[PDB]
Design a protein around this ligand. Structure first.
Ligand code: HEM
Ligand code: HEM
Ligand code: HEM
Ligand code: HEM
Lengths: 141, 145, 141, 145
């Protein structure tokens, strides 16, 4: 999400994700908690076991927010304002953790959409996830 | 790196299935496309303009193969990562002047490529072990910096 | 450079730097080449010795570009467009190196303006230098 | 870390002049102001709202002093950084879950504070040696991650 060509790639790739955005969000969270145990610290009130209902529900919320973002690529700060305050001012999430979640989401997309996850699309997605991360941490700036 | 016996065995079993030529070529190619500043170190490979030119470049495929072969050595020598990569650390620091952050980037790209190739078999638990491996290699390559 | 309060702190701090912007730019470059030897790679055509005329001249160019930036805090991408192309498309500078130069510039300011380099001002400057770095690497995004 | 004999001597000489209470309090305070996510780990210190509240907080000064004292141990044990920081690495990883990137951040803040306190005496050559020290401590604290 930045250049015209990147916006086109991101919109097209997310069309292929479609109604699976919630499921992929949940899986990406699972890959993150297992691969990067430092992240479990933000979720003391969750059951973090595999198949947990709370992770499922939260993954849906993450997927919906990403789906929102793709619809508002020309005004991410406006569309994601409530979430900036939450992550940066209330939760004080360490910015490094956004890079970790992004990697886990890219990993999850590779698993499920191997033919659609081309080098060009991977590069556009990376930029998109970095743009979202910047917005969510923008209160730190 | 410190893996359980179960973890090590699952890591090794997956490696049996890794085509170092296909995976290596794809991993290096994606690094060059997704993080374009890395192209600076590979000027002698010729045309690296667009994704099509990168992914089909014979020098990218040949070098990617060498990189994966070297990863493979690390995977079979998990107790002696520092010793296995000592010479390569020297080359990358002293001669090439590559910032160590880029070793982490290539490691993560390799994981994404493994995920693409193995699909559902590349489970959240298996990725977690590979993340350990990847970090261990990056740290071993950074040691002489 | 972002929030109103940060813009005010940055403008005020740079007023104290004043005509020394070039000298501080040169010193920051020197601290970078010595502290972080990987950076010397981008300057093979320079004499990198202490007191070198080329480092002096280049430090002046860096200081002037920062002085420009402070005058255009509401449109950094517009003001710094020529420089984005140079650093990202022609030179392919690794983004990590911007964080290193920023640290060295902050170090140099601490040396010369110890009474003016307060915690509030340090925080605003950090944000300013990060905003400049983002613009100069924006072609990567 | 690997310093020449001349470098080590200059590092040690500067440390003779370091007030661990003043420098330590200022370094931790600036970390909390400049990188506000770090405040998450220090909730028990009370009011950390604004720069004024942070810099004057007695718990921030007392903890900053402890951190600098521990840095001082590293400076006097440059050959055995890993051994000197083994216990603290365990605490920071296992108990506190601090991301290692933050050790680098605190190290750089400490250098900026040294620059502020020593002015022209903190030469480009002396900063270069301190950068080595700071990286060595960060790496030693990250070792058990
Ligand atoms: C792509 C980046 C991210 C997106 C789109 C995102 C999205 C969201 C959304 C939409 C919510 C609101 C749920 C609700 O209103 O109940 C939320 C909450 C939350 N997020 Fe994030 N998030 C991101 C990154 C992160 C990261 C990296 C962390 C930490 C590792 C994190 C930790 C949390 C926590 C602790 C909550 C509150 C959960 C609760 O108490 O129910 N988020 N996130
Ligand atoms: C997982 C991390 C990495 C591994 C395992 C690895 C491995 C290797 C190997 C095996 C060689 C061949 C050395 C020889 O001929 O003896 C090499 C060379 C080289 N590497 Fe890496 N490497 C890594 C990361 C990187 C990165 C991130 C860069 C990007 C700057 C890089 C840039 C180069 C270059 C420019 C060469 C020389 C190729 C030539 O002959 O022109 N390496 N590396
Ligand atoms: C605050 C961030 C930076 C600013 C404001 C800045 C500013 C400038 C300016 C104004 C020029 C143009 C000089 C001319 O037109 O002759 C330039 C050129 C250049 N910059 Fe940067 N720069 C920054 C960061 C960096 C970094 C981090 C590096 C690499 C470590 C770098 C490497 C170069 C090189 C190699 C040139 C060409 C020099 C020559 O051949 O004469 N710059 N920079
Ligand atoms: C240069 C790197 C660092 C050094 C040398 C250092 C040193 C120390 C020392 C000496 C202690 C006291 C341990 C004891 O009582 O036995 C401590 C505790 C602690 N550290 Fe660090 N530290 C570093 C980095 C960090 C960072 C970046 C954070 C930010 C998350 C952090 C968070 C904490 C916390 C929350 C405690 C516990 C304080 C309490 O009792 O509530 N440390 N550290």
């Amino acid at each position: 999400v930045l250049s015209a060509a990147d916006k086109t790639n991101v919109k097209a790739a997310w069309s292929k994700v479609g109604g699976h955005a919630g499921e992929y969000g949940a899986e990406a969270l699972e890959r993150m908690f297992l691969g990067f145990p430092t992240t479990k610290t933000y979720f003391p009130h969750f059951d973090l076991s595999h198949g947990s209902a709370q992770v499922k529900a939260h993954g849906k919320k993450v997927g919906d927010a990403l789906t929102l973002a793709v619809g508002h690529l020309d005004d991410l700060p406006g569309a994601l304002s409530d979430l900036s305050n939450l992550h940066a001012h209330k939760l004080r999430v360490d910015p490094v953790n956004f890079k970790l979640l992004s990697h886990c989401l890219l990993s999850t997309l590779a698993v499920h959409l191997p033919n659609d996850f081309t080098p060009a699309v991977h590069a556009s997605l990376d930029k998109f996830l970095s743009s979202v991360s910047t917005v969510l941490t923008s209160k730190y700036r | 790196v410190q893996l359980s016996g179960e973890e090590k065995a699952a890591v090794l079993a997956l490696w049996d299935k890794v085509n170092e030529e296909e995976v290596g070529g794809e991993a290096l190619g994606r690094l060059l496309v997704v993080y374009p500043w890395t192209q600076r170190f590979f000027d002698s490979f010729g045309d690296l303009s667009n994704p099509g030119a990168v992914m089909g470049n014979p020098k990218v495929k040949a070098h990617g193969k060498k990189v994966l072969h070297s990863f493979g050595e690390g995977v079979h020598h998990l107790d002696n990562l520092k010793g296995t990569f000592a010479a390569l650390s020297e080359l990358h620091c002293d001669k090439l002047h590559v910032d160590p952050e880029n070793f982490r980037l290539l490691g993560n790209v390799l994981v994404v490529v493994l995920a693409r190739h193995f699909g559902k078999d590349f489970t959240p638990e298996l990725q977690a072990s590979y993340q350990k491996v990847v970090a261990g290699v990056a740290n071993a390559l950074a040691h002489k910096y």
